[PDB]
Paper text:
The R2TP complex is found in organisms from yeast to humans, and consists of the AAA+ ATPases Rvb1 and Rvb2 (human: RUVBL1 and RUVBL2), a TPR-containing protein, Tah1 (human: Spagh or RPAP3), and Pih1 (also known as NOP17 and Pih1D1, but referred to as Pih1 henceforth; Kakihara and Houry, 2012; Te et al., 2007). The biological roles ascribed to the R2TP complex are directly associated with its ability to interact with the Hsp90 chaperone system and function as an Hsp90 cochaperone (Boulon et al., 2010; Izumi et al., 2012; Takai et al., 2010). Here we present crystal structures of Hsp90-Tah1-Pih1, Hsp90-Spagh/RPAP3, and Pih1-Tel2 complexes that together define key structural links within the R2TP core in yeast and in animals and reveal how R2TP connects the Hsp90 chaperone system to the TTT complex involved in PIKK activation.
We next determined the crystal structures of each of the TPR domains (TPR1 and 2) of human Spagh/RPAP3 cocrystallized with the Hsp90 C-terminal peptide. Spagh-TPR2267–381 consists of six α helices, with the first five again aligning with Tah1-TPR. The N-terminal helix of Spagh-TPR2 is double the length of the N-terminal helices of Tah1 or Spagh-TPR1 and projects out of the core TPR domain. The peptide bound to TPR2 adopts a compacted conformation very similar to the Tah1 complex, making extensive interactions with the walls of the groove. The Hsp90 peptide bound to TPR1 makes fewer interactions and is less well structured, but in both cases the α-carboxyl and the side chain of the C-terminal aspartic acid are bound by a “carboxylate clamp” (Scheufler et al., 2000), anchored by the side chains of Asn 172 (TPR1) and Asn 321 (TPR2), each of which make a bidentate interaction with the peptide NH and α-carboxyl of the C-terminal aspartic acid residue of the Hsp90 peptide. The TPR1 and TPR2 domains of Spagh/RPAP3 have a typical TPR domain structure, but lack the distinct hydrophobic pocket formed between helices 5 and 7, into which the methionine side chain of the MEEVD motif binds (Morgan et al., 2012; Zhang et al., 2005). Instead and similar to Tah1, the methionine side chain packs against the surface of helix 5 and remains partially exposed. Mutation of TPR1 (N172E) or TPR2 (N321E) and fitting with a two site model suggested that binding for one site (nonmutant site) remained unaffected (N172E-TPR1 mutant, TPR2: KD = 9.7 μM and N321E-TPR2 mutant, TPR1: KD = 0.94 μM), whereas the mutated TPR sites were compromised for binding (N172E-TPR1 mutant, TPR1: KD = ∼231 μM and N321E-TPR2 mutant, TPR2: KD = ∼109 μM).
Residue numbers in the entry:
A (entry chain A): 267 to 381
B (entry chain C): 1 to 7
The structure:
């Protein structure tokens, strides 16, 4: 009854994927400030997709944040620790933040994944 | 630059 409607409430979370694609569309044309919006709205409805915080972290990198990029990357890795891009981006953000050891090990983590 | 690519 309510449980099936709950699985339906799940499967309807493709909103996240479309917000993802749209935000990506904004990113590819240099419009990051709306990419982040689509990414946020995408996160609000699931939730457990690493692509959203990863890409949002990349946009954050493109607008000189690093802190926000680092937090989003950490979350993305928490969701999927097999996504090398999150590690690379977090390594970049940390490199800009002055966290050189951690950035280094994130980088050789990228090297370790890809390979 | 490949990390720059968005999936």
């Amino acid at each position: 009854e309510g449980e099936r409607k709950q699985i339906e409430a799940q499967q309807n979370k493709q909103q996240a994927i479309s917000e993802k694609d749209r935000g990506n569309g904004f990113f590819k044309e240099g419009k990051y400030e709306r990419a982040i919006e689509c990414y946020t709205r995408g996160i609000a409805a699931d939730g457990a997709n690493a692509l959203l915080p990863a890409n949002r972290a990349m946009a954050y990198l493109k607008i000189q944040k690093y802190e926000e990029a680092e937090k989003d990357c950490t979350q993305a890795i928490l969701l999927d620790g097999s996504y090398s891009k999150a590690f690379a981006r977090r390594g970049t953000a940390r490199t800009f933040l002055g966290k050189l050891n951690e950035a280094k090990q994130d980088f050789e983590t990228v090297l370790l994944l890809e390979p | 630059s490949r990390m720059e690519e968005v999936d």
